[PDB]
Amino acid sequence: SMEQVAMELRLTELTRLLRSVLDQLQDKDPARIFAQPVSLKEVPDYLDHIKHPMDFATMRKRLEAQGYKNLHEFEEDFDLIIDNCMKYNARDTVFYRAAVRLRDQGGVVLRQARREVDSIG
């Protein structure tokens, strides 16, 4: 139908905007701490601690399959990256501190993304 196509064009445009948001968030991780999944070869107990692991490559795969229907879903995955790290790693670690900085800096980007998504519909 024509409606399905219009819906698909909106999803494609949301995907465009989320790709730009993802790129901007990932620039706030210059150490690439959150770039890839935590390795189960190197942290064999990880899934005993963290039930829903997340990282920027896994988000990018979902994104390019147009798997985020709305900004809320995308933010849920970003929040998992941060929140998983702040539980697994202690406060005094480069990892925890990297998450805090990513959270704080990403807040600004996500604030304007919400306005853009609402604004453009």
DSSP secondary structure string, 32-83?
-TTSSPPPTTTSTTHHHH-SS---HHHHHHHHHTT--SSHHHHHHHHHHHHH
Find the farthest-apart pair of alpha carbons in the chain and give their distance in angstroms, rounded: 56
31, 98 in Cβ contact below 8 A?
Answer: yes
Contacts of 52 (CB under 8 A, 6+ apart): 80, 84
Residues in the chain: 121
Cα dihedral: 65, 68, 69, 73 (round 10):
160
Method: X-ray
Locate 100 and state its tokens: 């805090």
Resolution expressed in Å:
1.8
Query: In terms of C-beta distances under 8 Å and separation of at least 24 residues, what long-range contacts does 106-109 make, across chains too?
Result: 106/25, 106/28, 106/78, 109/21, 109/24, 109/25, 109/28
Element (H, E) at 26: helix 2-27
Contacts of 80 (CB under 8 A, 6+ apart): 52, 53, 54
110, 75 in Cβ contact below 8 A?
Answer: yes
Q: Which of 71, 60, 63 is nearest to 114 (CA)?
A: 71
**Alpha-carbon span 15 to 92, nearest angstrom:** 36
Give φ, ψ of 62 to 5 degrees: -60, -45
CATH number corresponding to 1-121: 1.20.920.10
Q: Which of 32, 35, 41 is nearest to 58 (CA)?
A: 35
